[PDB]
Design a protein around this nucleic acid. Structure first.
Ligand code: MG
Ligand code: MG
Ligand code: MG
Ligand code: MG
Ligand code: MG
Ligand code: MG
Ligand code: MG
Ligand code: MG
Ligand code: MG
Ligand code: MG
Ligand code: MG
Ligand code: MG
Ligand code: MG
Ligand code: MG
Ligand code: MG
Ligand code: MG
Ligand code: MG
Ligand code: MG
Ligand code: MG
Ligand code: MG
Ligand code: MG
Ligand code: MG
Ligand code: MG
Ligand code: MG
Ligand code: MG
Ligand code: MG
Ligand code: MG
Ligand code: MG
Ligand code: MG
Ligand code: MG
Ligand code: MG
Ligand code: MG
Ligand code: MG
Ligand code: MG
Ligand code: MG
Ligand code: MG
Ligand code: MG
Ligand code: MG
Ligand code: MG
Ligand code: MG
Ligand code: MG
Ligand code: MG
Ligand code: MG
Ligand code: MG
Ligand code: MG
Ligand code: MG
Ligand code: MG
Ligand code: MG
Ligand code: MG
Ligand code: MG
Ligand code: MG
Ligand code: MG
Ligand code: MG
Ligand code: MG
Ligand code: MG
Ligand code: MG
Ligand code: MG
Ligand code: MG
Ligand code: MG
Ligand code: MG
Ligand code: MG
Ligand code: MG
Ligand code: MG
Ligand code: MG
Ligand code: MG
Ligand code: MG
Ligand code: MG
Ligand code: MG
Ligand code: MG
Ligand code: MG
Ligand code: MG
Ligand code: MG
Ligand code: MG
Ligand code: MG
Ligand code: MG
Ligand code: MG
Ligand code: MG
Ligand code: MG
Ligand code: MG
Ligand code: MG
Ligand code: MG
Ligand code: MG
Ligand code: MG
Ligand code: MG
Ligand code: MG
Ligand code: MG
Ligand code: MG
Ligand code: MG
Ligand code: MG
Ligand code: MG
Ligand code: MG
Ligand code: MG
Ligand code: MG
Ligand code: MG
Ligand code: MG
Ligand code: MG
Ligand code: MG
Ligand code: MG
Ligand code: MG
Ligand code: MG
Ligand code: MG
Ligand code: MG
Ligand code: MG
Ligand code: MG
Ligand code: MG
Ligand code: MG
Ligand code: MG
Ligand code: MG
Ligand code: MG
Ligand code: MG
Ligand code: MG
Ligand code: MG
Ligand code: MG
Ligand code: MG
Ligand code: MG
Ligand code: MG
Ligand code: MG
Ligand code: MG
Ligand code: MG
Ligand code: MG
Ligand code: MG
Ligand code: MG
Ligand code: MG
Ligand code: MG
Ligand code: MG
Ligand code: MG
Ligand code: MG
Ligand code: MG
Ligand code: MG
Ligand code: MG
Ligand code: MG
Ligand code: MG
Ligand code: MG
Ligand code: MG
Ligand code: MG
Ligand code: MG
Ligand code: MG
Ligand code: MG
Ligand code: MG
Ligand code: MG
Ligand code: MG
Ligand code: MG
Ligand code: MG
Ligand code: MG
Ligand code: MG
Ligand code: MG
Ligand code: MG
Ligand code: MG
Lengths: 137, 122, 204, 52, 117
RNA sequence: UAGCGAAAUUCCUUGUCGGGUAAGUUCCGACCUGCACGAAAAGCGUAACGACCGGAGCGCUGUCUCGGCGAGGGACCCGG
RNA sequence: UGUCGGCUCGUCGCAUCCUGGGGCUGAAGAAGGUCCCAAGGGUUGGGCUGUUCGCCCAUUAAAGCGGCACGCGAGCUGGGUUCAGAACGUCGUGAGACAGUUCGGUCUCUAUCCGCCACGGGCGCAGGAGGCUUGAGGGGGGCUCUUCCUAGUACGAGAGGACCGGAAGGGACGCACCUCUGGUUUCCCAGCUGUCCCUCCAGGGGCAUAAGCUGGGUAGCCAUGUGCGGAAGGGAUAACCGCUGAAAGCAUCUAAGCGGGAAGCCCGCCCCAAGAUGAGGCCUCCCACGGCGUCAAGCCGGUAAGGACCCGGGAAGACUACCCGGUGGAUGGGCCGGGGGUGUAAGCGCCGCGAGGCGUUGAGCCGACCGGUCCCAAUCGUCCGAGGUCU
């Protein structure tokens, strides 16, 4: 009995592992399986991760973009059986965790407020192709 | 979630730029209305010589909302504004081409015209 | 009429096909039938289920004799499922199969001495235009000389919650015999680590 | 003085009745291993001492 | 009702934090201290975390204790005599015996906070 | 008489017409059958001024749909 | 014996607004008219006015009427109405005056009894005890719409358009829940400004509220979020429809008798409930007298099964009660691990004149959640508790 939580964690096996690291303050696009009529699309959603809300499994994260003049925000269960892929598309200096502040002034300002994590970025490309060397060769 | 007195943004060339909600047209006493719902509304401001005038009492359908809507698959979605498209009493969109994204719920609700005319459907 | 004891462990969500489903994790741990109740000598039919093991240190009570008269390991808690005569041994989450539906009883969370505002979801009075000492108050509670009293039943502030609560027709989503877990559609009374009985519904 | 006010002098009986549960109870004391004196349970006390 | 939560206390935000500081200081000055069972039971933990922090070393943790306590001379006593004593002992640097005697003229039950040994 | 007029004066009265509103017994323009304005108990008008009284719009918000949580001083429990 | 209106909370009637049932129809169908049965539940939001009333906007299944001191001011408000001020019209020589207008104008912290909402103490339940039930009696709830199929069928010239039966989704409401959504989270973290201080730099503390401010936030609590309910089904019945049927050769639903028949009645569902003194029932445990009372029911100190006190505590809680734990122990505190929150601590090295920047580093800190470990503390102990009436 003593592990009422560990018990919960056992119900968890619906959890994914493939999906990549990505922390708030850096853009990324998720591929979402969608039901157009009856068949199934794979609508993409590219935008900035506005807030990651950690809670082990069922931790969620939220993306923000501006399709056609209107700003739009989506939320995804980090372990949803409906996220085909999720490619990171750029990384930036956060300096904060939850960052809804980007809402009330997005533009040339939103840029020069999340420059580029040339730190993490270099870990990206480097350990990216590097670890690829050790599986190519 | 829209309710009476709420100002919507008009998402089409209806001619109208803004309308206030008069009645949420669900049940006999619905508190609010979200995407896919229809509402009676007043044209509180509108473009010159447009197809619709200020004070025109009209029906429309919510297509974008500040309060997030929950998809059955656990996902959610919200827009930066509350928007709606003015419609026929036949429930067909008066003005032609609409602009700004729209919610997928309109699909399940049977507004093919608008989801068609949509620049994008999130 | 199936029935089985358990404890509310907590709750999260799982995905059915491609659509998320909120669920509470009951734990219908092994329950040894400790006594049968027949009309022959009880007047009614039911089954004394036991639940959760116990160190003989507290069982010092001659309860040991009750558990003895049935050769069972002395449990901690035991309650009856009515009109349910199993077979002469032990019930499991197995009595329930996925897709079945269940009624569930529990002791709601204790909200203590409650404001009528919350106890009965009243509406009290104006946050503003006057009186200011009657905000969360009930207002009138009767009429003049006639009747001249107050109805037995009048909704008034008092102890709210910690009562017995049965919630109806939950669907049994999953059942993991491996570790004695019942998976239902979330809405189940009591707090985590709380005791709770679960049984067949009355759709018919 | 203001609004609510007792209608009738409380009966001297009805009074003492209200005092039904007013009586006190003796403090719970116990002999200690140290001195022969009396302590309340779970309490270090003078003429005695303790151990850790 | 509230309380489903955790912890307890009278007074208010500042005055209450300051209470713990002032009590810890004196506990770390005299080792033994007598106050009301409650204050004692609370002060209990607050102190330990301090002791156990001084049980560590980095001036970091030094400065961290330097926050609640304020006397430099006093923090030395903590690192250079208190912490040493309690090395090789996981927590519990603090004991709380219930006093058998009530404060007069307020009926308050007293008790005993003491640096364990 | 001039001027003014459903008025801090209009009973019928929410008078009629127009403006404002989705919808206006209020407000504002107008007409005049003024129950019962009217010329120093002054008539009409007037920039500015007003913790005076009326109507409207923007802004903003627990005023409200409709409540929730939280803090301290009471209220509760023990001693005086 | 405080008077209108509003607000809060309602509850009852039924002469029924809606949903249910039914006869007649100038009822083809759909829709409607009208009468009869039928309170179970339901009976929206805004403009105008102090308003009640009413007109109007937009909806609805519908936007019922009325009683309860025109319910409800020791509950609230105080726009109107009824004081003192001031004014207009208006009457009066005047002082003043007007169901004529107009602006202003002090609604009382403590509930004794009944009643009500909750929660305890006592005694009882003719042995003492631990646990588990029965359900007499009672309470809660009882709403409804839309689309799809049957069927573009019956019906109708057509335009329209069903019964019956079946599926799907929605409004309001109610119980419960924190997974998700979303709030708060008063010191969990971070940043910022003035100042005063430790200790000169760095680092840090107080105060700026009862958090100085700002950004963000777990558990808990919660609604905007989640799940579930209204039935189904059995019985009796209303208006009504009908069988068999006489008085009264026929005829008649009735007089004997029988079947059909409502959101309604009884049950069924959820909650309370043996102070149901008519104190129920089942499983298990304890068991004689040991001493005065001869006769009789009593009395006394010791007892048993057991319980209590005390202490550590708890999604229990005003208090008490309820519940768990008490070393044979993981009950609270501490420590440790995880979860979570914040978002690269300090110190040092490097770059820059400098503010700063970069590495170390997802670092440091770290409440409430999940769990581990006897370091801390629940030590030691005391008191009560049958010996079981008679037929
Ligand atoms: Mg707006
Ligand atoms: Mg205009
Ligand atoms: Mg208009
Ligand atoms: Mg107009
Ligand atoms: Mg989706
Ligand atoms: Mg979907
Ligand atoms: Mg068109
Ligand atoms: Mg969808
Ligand atoms: Mg359509
Ligand atoms: Mg398109
Ligand atoms: Mg027993
Ligand atoms: Mg039952
Ligand atoms: Mg039954
Ligand atoms: Mg079985
Ligand atoms: Mg007032
Ligand atoms: Mg006032
Ligand atoms: Mg007041
Ligand atoms: Mg007042
Ligand atoms: Mg007052
Ligand atoms: Mg009264
Ligand atoms: Mg009476
Ligand atoms: Mg098996
Ligand atoms: Mg197993
Ligand atoms: Mg007492
Ligand atoms: Mg000693
Ligand atoms: Mg705790
Ligand atoms: Mg202070
Ligand atoms: Mg302060
Ligand atoms: Mg001190
Ligand atoms: Mg002192
Ligand atoms: Mg700590
Ligand atoms: Mg050091
Ligand atoms: Mg000093
Ligand atoms: Mg003239
Ligand atoms: Mg007029
Ligand atoms: Mg004038
Ligand atoms: Mg008018
Ligand atoms: Mg007009
Ligand atoms: Mg007009
Ligand atoms: Mg005028
Ligand atoms: Mg006249
Ligand atoms: Mg004249
Ligand atoms: Mg004159
Ligand atoms: Mg004159
Ligand atoms: Mg003048
Ligand atoms: Mg003038
Ligand atoms: Mg002027
Ligand atoms: Mg003035
Ligand atoms: Mg002046
Ligand atoms: Mg207005
Ligand atoms: Mg302006
Ligand atoms: Mg405004
Ligand atoms: Mg408080
Ligand atoms: Mg209290
Ligand atoms: Mg008191
Ligand atoms: Mg009738
Ligand atoms: Mg009639
Ligand atoms: Mg009807
Ligand atoms: Mg018809
Ligand atoms: Mg009819
Ligand atoms: Mg008036
Ligand atoms: Mg209305
Ligand atoms: Mg009424
Ligand atoms: Mg009258
Ligand atoms: Mg009358
Ligand atoms: Mg009245
Ligand atoms: Mg009053
Ligand atoms: Mg009044
Ligand atoms: Mg009144
Ligand atoms: Mg006033
Ligand atoms: Mg007025
Ligand atoms: Mg007045
Ligand atoms: Mg006067
Ligand atoms: Mg005169
Ligand atoms: Mg008159
Ligand atoms: Mg007035
Ligand atoms: Mg004034
Ligand atoms: Mg007045
Ligand atoms: Mg007061
Ligand atoms: Mg009072
Ligand atoms: Mg009383
Ligand atoms: Mg109770
Ligand atoms: Mg007592
Ligand atoms: Mg009692
Ligand atoms: Mg009954
Ligand atoms: Mg009933
Ligand atoms: Mg009832
Ligand atoms: Mg009722
Ligand atoms: Mg068809
Ligand atoms: Mg046809
Ligand atoms: Mg067809
Ligand atoms: Mg046709
Ligand atoms: Mg035909
Ligand atoms: Mg035909
Ligand atoms: Mg035709
Ligand atoms: Mg047709
Ligand atoms: Mg649907
Ligand atoms: Mg939280
Ligand atoms: Mg400072
Ligand atoms: Mg200092
Ligand atoms: Mg100071
Ligand atoms: Mg100082
Ligand atoms: Mg201060
Ligand atoms: Mg803040
Ligand atoms: Mg926030
Ligand atoms: Mg709700
Ligand atoms: Mg809703
Ligand atoms: Mg039900
Ligand atoms: Mg429902
Ligand atoms: Mg339903
Ligand atoms: Mg139902
Ligand atoms: Mg039947
Ligand atoms: Mg029948
Ligand atoms: Mg009968
Ligand atoms: Mg016939
Ligand atoms: Mg015959
Ligand atoms: Mg005859
Ligand atoms: Mg015959
Ligand atoms: Mg008969
Ligand atoms: Mg029958
Ligand atoms: Mg029948
Ligand atoms: Mg019961
Ligand atoms: Mg019982
Ligand atoms: Mg009886
Ligand atoms: Mg014996
Ligand atoms: Mg004898
Ligand atoms: Mg004798
Ligand atoms: Mg205790
Ligand atoms: Mg306690
Ligand atoms: Mg115990
Ligand atoms: Mg003991
Ligand atoms: Mg624990
Ligand atoms: Mg704990
Ligand atoms: Mg920890
Ligand atoms: Mg965990
Ligand atoms: Mg972690
Ligand atoms: Mg983390
Ligand atoms: Mg750094
Ligand atoms: Mg720092
Ligand atoms: Mg650093
Ligand atoms: Mg340099
Ligand atoms: Mg780490
Ligand atoms: Mg460290
Ligand atoms: Mg660390
Ligand atoms: Mg940690
Ligand atoms: Mg801290
Ligand atoms: Mg160990
Ligand atoms: Mg006999």
């Amino acid at each position: 009995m003593n592990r009422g939580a560990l018990i919960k964690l056992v119900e968890s096996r619906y959890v994914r592992t493939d999906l990549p690291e990505f922390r708030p303050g850096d853009t990324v696009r998720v591929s979402y399986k969608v039901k157009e009529g009856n068949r199934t699309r794979i609508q993409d959603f590219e935008g900035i991760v506005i807030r990651i809300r950690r809670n082990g499994f069922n931790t969620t994260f939220t993306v923000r973009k501006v399709s056609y003049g209107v700003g739009v925000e989506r939320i995804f269960p980090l372990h949803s059986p409906l996220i085909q892929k999720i490619d990171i598309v750029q990384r930036g200096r956060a300096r904060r965790a939850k960052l809804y502040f980007i809402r009330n002034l997005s533009d040339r300002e939103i840029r020069r407020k999340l420059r580029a994590d040339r730190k993490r970025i270099d870990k990206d490309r480097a350990a990216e192709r590097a670890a690829k060397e050790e599986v190519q060769k | 979630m829209i309710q009476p007195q709420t100002y919507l943004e008009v998402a089409d060339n209806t001619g109208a730029r803004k309308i206030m909600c008069i009645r949420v047209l669900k049940g006999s006493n619905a508190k609010y209305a979200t995407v896919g719902d229809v509402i009676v509304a007043s044209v509180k401001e509108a473009i010159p010589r447009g197809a619709v005038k200020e004070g025109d009492v009209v029906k429309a359908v919510v297509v974008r909302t500040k309060k997030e809507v929950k998809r059955p698959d656990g996902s959610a979605i919200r827009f930066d504004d509350n928007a709606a498209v003015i419609i026929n009493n036949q429930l067909e969109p008066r003005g032609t081409r609409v602009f700004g994204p729209v919610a997928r719920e309109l699909r399940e609700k049977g507004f093919m015209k608008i989801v068609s005319l949509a620049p994008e459907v999130l | 009429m199936k029935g089985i004891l358990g404890v509310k462990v907590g709750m999260t969500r799982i995905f059915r096909d491609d659509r998320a489903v909120p669920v509470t994790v009951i734990l219908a741990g092994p329950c040894p039938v400790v006594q049968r109740r027949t009309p022959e000598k009880d007047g009614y039919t039911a089954v004394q289920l036991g639940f959760l093991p116990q160190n003989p240190k507290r069982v010092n009570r001659p309860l040991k004799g009750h558990f003895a008269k049935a050769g069972v390991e002395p449990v901690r808690i035991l309650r009856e499922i009515r009109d349910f005569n199993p077979e002469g041994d032990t019930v499991t989450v197995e009595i329930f199969k996925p897709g079945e539906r269940v009624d569930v009883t529990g002791t709601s969370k204790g909200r203590g001495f409650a404001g009528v505002m919350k106890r009965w979801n009243f509406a009290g009075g104006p946050d503003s235009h006057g009186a200011h000492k009657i905000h969360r108050h009930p207002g009138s509670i009767g009429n003049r000389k006639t009747p001249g009293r107050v109805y037995k039943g009048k909704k008034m502030a008092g102890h709210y919650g910690a009562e017995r609560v049965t919630v109806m027709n939950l669907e049994v989503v999953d059942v993991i015999p491996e570790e004695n877990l019942l998976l239902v559609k979330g809405a189940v009374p009591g707090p985590n680590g709380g005791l709770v009985i679960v049984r067949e519904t009355k759709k018919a | 003085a203001k609004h609510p006010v007792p209608k009738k002098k409380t009966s001297k009986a009805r009074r003492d009745a209200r005092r039904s549960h007013h009586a006190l109870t003796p403090p719970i004391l116990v002999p200690c291993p140290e001195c022969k004196a009396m302590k309340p349970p779970h309490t270090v006390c003078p003429e005695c001492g303790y151990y850790a | 009702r509230h309380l489903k939560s955790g912890r307890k206390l009278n007074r208010h935000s500042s005055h209450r934090l300051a209470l713990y500081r002032n009590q810890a200081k004196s506990l770390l000055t005299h080792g033994r201290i007598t106050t009301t069972v409650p204050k004692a039971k609370e002060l209990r933990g607050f102190v330990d975390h301090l002791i156990h922090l001084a049980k560590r070393g980095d001036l970091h943790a030094r400065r961290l204790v330097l926050r609640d306590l304020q006397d430099v001379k006093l923090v030395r006593k903590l690192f250079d005599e208190i912490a040493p004593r309690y090395r090789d002992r996981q927590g519990g640097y603090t004991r709380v015996l219930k006093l058998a005697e009530r404060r007069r003229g307020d009926g308050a039950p007293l008790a005993l906070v003491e640096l364990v040994e």
